[PDB]
């Protein structure tokens, strides 16, 4: 009945809670939108992991950033990131926006997604297979659990 014991219990409770049913919103900007959808396709079904795509950041937390980013687009991205409730996360996806990837050298790309938002896990691919993504988000839960 040490106070630290109870704190360990509540720690487990809320971090398990948040990690157990996070609700992505998605900028499926480019062509990695479709692979995102195959995560939600029946064959892999993101929903069984509890995650469910719900639009409008205010009702959502973790954010996927599928697909290539561009200059005009960026400010909207920063807006949306700011309007999310704490404890917000994000997830860079593909070689897309990890750092421009294929389009690393053009005037309109904004290199990494990192340079506008504080990314959590990366999921390299081009497109990443939806399953590699799945390993991505599970890894995200194994990072929340350490919160």
């Amino acid at each position: 009945s040490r106070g630290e014991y109870v704190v360990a219990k509540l720690d487990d409770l809320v971090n398990w809670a948040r990690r157990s049913s996070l609700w992505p919103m998605t900028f499926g900007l480019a062509c990695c939108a479709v692979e995102m959808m195959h995560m939600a396709a029946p064959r892999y079904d993101m929903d069984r992991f509890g995650v469910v795509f719900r639009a409008s950041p205010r009702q959502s937390d973790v954010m996927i950033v599928a697909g290539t980013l561009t200059n005009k687009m960026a400010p909207a991205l920063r807006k949306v990131y700011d309007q999310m409730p704490e404890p917000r996360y994000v997830v860079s996806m593909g070689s897309c926006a990890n750092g421009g990837g294929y389009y690393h050298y053009s005037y309109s790309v904004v290199r990494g997604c990192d340079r506008i938002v504080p990314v959590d896990i990366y999921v390299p691919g081009c497109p990443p297979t939806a399953e590699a993504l799945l390993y991505g988000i599970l890894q995200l839960q194994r990072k929340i659990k350490r919160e």
């Binding site: 892999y44 070689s95 750092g99 990494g112 990366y122 390299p124 081009c126 399953e131 799945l134 890894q139």
Partner: protein, 149 residues
């Protein structure tokens, strides 16, 4: 009528067996030709294969690769800092095709999502370690595939 028809249709799809695989515990079908994590790999002799013909740099569209060869003390050609960055690599598999000595190989592994950007930018040693981890596996794919090449 047609309304209840379609409604009866989704009733009918309730009774079919669900398509989901139980990942992680089960994992989806792939192919011998599938492309994923890179990994330089050795001769059976234990010697490394790479010989810095450097055209892996010369054919990658993302130009992810950077190479800086210097001579071995023995006098054999070798890399000093072969490196690559998954941040820019597009997994097109041109490198897989290009290598004359068949050194770099696009490995079967497809999962290596990571916390920090700096980890993506693989060093040479990292690629070798990937080549060590998987070698029986990769050699299996290439064994199963090369005739079609």
């Amino acid at each position: 009528t047609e309304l209840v028809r379609g409604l009866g249709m989704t009733l009918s799809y309730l009774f079919r067996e669900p398509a989901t695989i139980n990942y992680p515990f089960e994992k989806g079908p792939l192919s011998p030709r599938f492309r994923g994590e890179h990994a330089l790999r050795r001769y059976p002799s234990g010697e490394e294969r790479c010989i810095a013909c450097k055209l892996c740099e010369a054919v990658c569209p993302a130009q992810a690769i950077t190479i800086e060869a210097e001579p071995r003390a023995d006098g054999s050609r070798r890399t000093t800092r072969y490196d690559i960055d998954m941040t820019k690599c597009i997994y097109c598999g041109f490198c897989q095709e290009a290598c004359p000595v068949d050194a770099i190989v696009e490995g079967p592994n497809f999962e290596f999502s990571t916390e920090t950007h700096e980890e993506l930018l693989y060093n040479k040693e990292k690629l070798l370690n990937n080549g060590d981890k998987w070698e029986a596996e990769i050699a299996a794919n290439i064994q199963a595939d090369y005739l079609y090449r």
